[model samples]
Target: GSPLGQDVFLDYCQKLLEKFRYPWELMPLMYVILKDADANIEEASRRIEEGQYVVNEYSRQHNLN
Candidate 1:
């Protein structure tokens, strides 16, 4: 479960969406992250690191996680 409450999560999501340049594309990614209720800091950090690799691979082909 999330350490932060639902209200905090919503607020954080709003802030993120507001700052995101491509909301259409990024929203899906954000949804996946938000749905990860069991995610911890280590898992989140790992995902971020892996996301860069995924993005790089995606630029060449469709190998995103």
Candidate 2:
């Protein structure tokens, strides 16, 4: 019901991870989220679209922010 972070929701992000060869940086919390999804891109995509509350809760829980 909520929007995702722009960077993660944009088409370029999918292309970057799947097609681009260049090195890139991601937020530590994002990494954690990805791991929580068992490193599955599609799973993480759905979770991310849940909105910043997901990341915010995880960040507070993990002291990552």
Candidate 3:
């Protein structure tokens, strides 16, 4: 997220994830978040993961699949 944005995100996956890659469907959304916007990777990742947690918990509580 420092000033690297999308490039950093790509390297981040390669380095940290190690042999894993972004799912095909997620690249476009990630590109829009990390490439086409001013927001950095940290904030983007936090929002995505944290929001997903809430969404999953909410769905579970509400009996959603």
Candidate 4:
């Protein structure tokens, strides 16, 4: 069963890459974070913040938010 659905995930990844300049290089680590919910939430939060910083910056630049 696809968690977020393959198409949606791909589209999200595409947007993340294109709009936010998100590092596709970090994807494997993101996968690890997703897989290990029992791991450090603070570390996961930090990673999410880094990603969202890019997204928010993109949004601000484009007046999307």
RMSD of each: 6.0, 11.9, 5.4, 10.0
Q: What is candidate 1's lDDT per residue for 13-50, written digit by digit as tens?
A: 45444544336557556545655733333454456557
lDDT tens per residue, model 3, 3-61: 76556666544432332245655555665554432445565566566667889889889
lDDT for each residue of candidate 2 in 1-65, tens digit (9 for 90 to 100): 55654445443444434432324555444556555766555776676656556777778799874
TM-score for model 1? 0.39
Q: Write out the backbone clash pairs for model 3.
A: none
* lDDT values, one for every candidate: 0.54, 0.54, 0.56, 0.56
The alpha-carbon lDDT assigned to residue 8 of candidate 3 equals 69
Worst 10 residues of 4 by lDDT: 34-43
Each candidate's number of clashing pairs is: 0, 0, 0, 0
Q: Which pairs clash inside model 2? A: none
TM-score of 3: 0.51
Candidate 4 regions off by >4 Å?
A: 1-38
Every model's TM-score:
0.39, 0.38, 0.51, 0.36
Q: Which rank order by TM-score, best down to worst?
A: 3, 1, 2, 4
**Residue 59's lDDT in candidate 3:** 89
Tell me the spans in candidate 2 whose CA falls farther than 4 Å from its real position: 1-26, 52-65
Ranking by lDDT: 4, 3, 2, 1
Error of 3 at 50 (Å): 1.8
